[PDB]
Design a protein around this ligand. Structure first.
Ligand SMILES: O=c1ccn([C@@H]2O[C@H](CO)[C@@H](O)[C@H]2O)c(=O)[nH]1
Ligand SMILES: *[C@@H]1O[C@H](CO)[C@@H](O)[C@H](O)[C@H]1NC(C)=O
Length: 246
């Protein structure tokens, strides 16, 4: 398992949690020195538990699929909550079975569906450590509309930060003050799958992507990533989704 406490949290302790989260995801190889997530894992070993504690020390446990860093559901108090989708239903056979009741959330876990449920795009939702503390608190008591917004914060502050060092740094910059994500952040989130794929197709193609990936950079400009020498590849991305899942 991995753990993070908001009480006394700072950029360093958050860094340590995102490092622990990355190190808990298994891989048998690296592609251009980046961990390649596994094609598949069966049984309960598919799911990592993240224990998150709000500032008052209340806790939820979040279940993460180690092959794609997808949040499947979470346990709050004695009740479990799972996204409305077959992968989460499968997760519910393995994790949080000791819960006294199981609620299926009235949406699947992907950004588009969560934004609909929440009534707003994530361009308009501040993120940071304070927002993460709020999110954890929200998820302690069922409210599906509020939970959708909280899950957008949770996904971005945990999974997406694990995937990209840039997003980890963004959250670190938002340790004591929330701010809406940069367009670069949004872009990286939306391109993880594409980048993961192109980095893998690059091996066998002399480090050149078969199809370029269009990103927004720190300054707000659209740039085209064409090969593995780009900083997105050499410094930023920390985990690759296996092309077997693309
Ligand atoms: O059950 C799900 C489905 C999607 N996602 C997130 O939403 C993104 C797709 O919109 C994925 O990359 C992942 O970060 C989850 O966390 N859980
Ligand atoms: C590869 O990417 C670099 C760095 O972004 C770029 O300047 C260069 O022209 C690209 N080369 C090829 C062969 O795609």
């Amino acid at each position: 398992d991995v753990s993070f406490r908001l009480s006394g949290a700072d950029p360093s302790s958050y860094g340590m949690f995102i490092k622990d989260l990355r190190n808990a995801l298994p891989h048998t190889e690296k592609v251009y020195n980046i961990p390649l997530l596994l094609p598949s894992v069966s049984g309960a070993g598919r799911y990592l538990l993240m224990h998150l504690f709000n500032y008052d020390g209340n806790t939820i446990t979040v279940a993460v699929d180690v092959t794609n860093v997808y949040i499947m559901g979470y346990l709050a108090l004695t009740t479990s909550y799972f996204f409305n989708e077959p992968a989460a239903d499968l997760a519910s056979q393995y994790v949080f079975r000791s819960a006294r009741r199981k609620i299926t959330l009235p949406y699947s876990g992907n950004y588009e569906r969560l934004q609909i449920a929440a009534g707003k795009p994530r361009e308009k939702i501040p993120i940071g450590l304070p927002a993460l503390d709020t999110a954890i608190s929200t998820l302690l008591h069922y409210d599906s509309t509020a939970a959708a917004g909280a899950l957008l914060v949770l996904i971005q502050t945990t999974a997406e930060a694990a995937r990209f060092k840039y997003i980890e740094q963004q959250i670190q910059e938002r340790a004591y003050r929330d701010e809406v994500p940069s367009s670069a952040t949004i872009s990286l989130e939306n391109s993880w799958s594409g980048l993961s794929k192109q980095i893998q197709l690059a091996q066998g193609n002399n480090g050149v992507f078969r199809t370029p990936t269009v990103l927004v950079d720190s300054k707000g400009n659209r740039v085209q990533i064409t090969n593995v020498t780009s900083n997105v590849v050499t410094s930023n991305i920390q985990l690759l989704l296996n092309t077997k899942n693309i």
